[PDB]
Design a protein around this ligand. Structure first.
Ligand code: NA
Lengths: 257, 256
DNA sequence: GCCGGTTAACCGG
DNA sequence: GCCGGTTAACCGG
């Protein structure tokens, strides 16, 4: 984690900072804390200037630093890693259509919010925003299915010391016409017990939890974390399939006749 | 539908409308073309003032004209219909603590953007907005499971002529730092072939379709539409119970 | 004290 | 045409 070292600095520049609210009034999903992410990234881009990238930004740099190679297959080789391609690359069509005149942009799908890279090591930072004027449910963190596939590809290629998936929670509350941050939390996904990750099937097969309450006591290796996750995943998928019937089938049998 | 009769007028007024790019960050989910919904509502209040209501606004006016009521239990009775209570009402604690000095505000999982009410008949209007400059996937229309519960409720309480769930799509495209409505469309859920609605399980069990493409040729009587929907839904759930093994399970067993 | 469903709307390594 | 995952973050008829 290239972030944990200067965490307090982050937490100190964020708490207290007021940012005028979005000219809409919703403050639901994407249209909420969003500007806090911008703040975090801006700080990092100035205090880790060379390690800090926006996912699409990293991709635009990757291809720009290799103008000699065109086509999608040659560009997919620029990742020198399957898992990394899975986690960060754009589609076949898009990858092939990229150019200095047609650069990549933000994409609702992008696995990460900001990218920190140094020494062929990658930190996938996803910043979560939370309105603490409510006591809502744990937000979507990452797709269980995506993580499952990511683990399977760590095992296949044997890439166990290449990337960390970390989370930064930014708590806020409305105050006048502004949103103001009241506190933050940090957590390393691969530092938590995988067998305990809660997967919310209906919620886009996403595992959900508040960064603030996530356990960080895992002791095995990254190879053992992945195995355990795939285990929990299959177990809970088998479980969901059976649980679905008891809730979405039987309760309505008395109508179909 | 109270909108359909005036639809040509709303399409006319919408096409050409512009709204400021909601935020510096790209427009996804709640941060997309939502502002246009405020324009639809505006037009409706302006031409159907006695019928046009925000969902929370309707609940606020309901409890408001019943000052003697008090208490969630007594207040739920005000709905005079179970199926409407299930689709519109708020939490028990939210209902209990309601007061003119503590009104309902919009909630994220409401159900409907706009409520057109008249003569005990309820039209639930949902506005879908879409970035037409690209070809994206059908958007989340409504929860398949929530629909099943409503159908189950309609059938049990035999209330088949109480409400309609309609949809308005308003397409836009980026013009500088403004979003401009370029097209529009409208369809009625209950006029569609229930057995053909696509249920996207992973995507919050949401049926998804582009409004402009929805089929409007159902024949039957609202009850058939419901019986036909529960049928399709259960079948899809069974199916989904299987497919979740061909994926998620069978292909990951190779690992421990 | 637990457990999970719903709004919004996105392309395809 | 058809099919279907993901990001965001929400409380409790
Ligand atoms: Na809407």
């Amino acid at each position: 984690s290239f972030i944990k070292p200067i965490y307090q600095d982050i937490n100190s520049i964020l708490i207290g900072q007021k940012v005028k609210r979005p000219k809409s009034g919703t403050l639901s999903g994407h249209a909420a804390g969003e500007p806090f992410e911008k703040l975090v990234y801006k700080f990092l881009k100035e205090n880790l200037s060379d390690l800090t990238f926006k996912q699409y930004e990293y991709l635009n740099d990757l291809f720009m630093k290799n103008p000699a190679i065109i086509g999608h297959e040659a560009r997919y080789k620029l990742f020198n890693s399957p898992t990394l391609l899975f986690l960060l690359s754009r589609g076949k069509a898009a990858t092939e259509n990229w150019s200095i005149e047609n650069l990549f942009e933000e994409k609702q799908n992008d696995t990460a919010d900001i990218l920190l890279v140094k020494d062929q090591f990658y930190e996938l930072l996803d910043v979560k925003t939370r309105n603490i004027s409510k006591s809502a449910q744990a937000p979507n963190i990452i797709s269980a299915y995506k993580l499952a596939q990511t683990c399977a590809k760590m095992i296949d290629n044997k890439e166990f010391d290449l990337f960390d998936i970390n989370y930064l929670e930014v708590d806020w509350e409305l105050n006048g016409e502004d949103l103001v941050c009241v506190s933050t939390s940090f957590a390393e996904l691969f530092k938590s017990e995988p067998s305990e990750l809660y997967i919310n099937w209906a919620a886009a097969m996403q595992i959900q939890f508040h960064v603030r309450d996530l356990d960080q006591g895992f002791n095995g290796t990254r190879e053992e974390w992945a195995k355990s996750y795939l285990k929990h995943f299959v177990t809970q998928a088998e479980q969901r399939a059976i649980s679905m019937i008891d809730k979405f089938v039987k309760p309505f049998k008395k109508y179909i006749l």
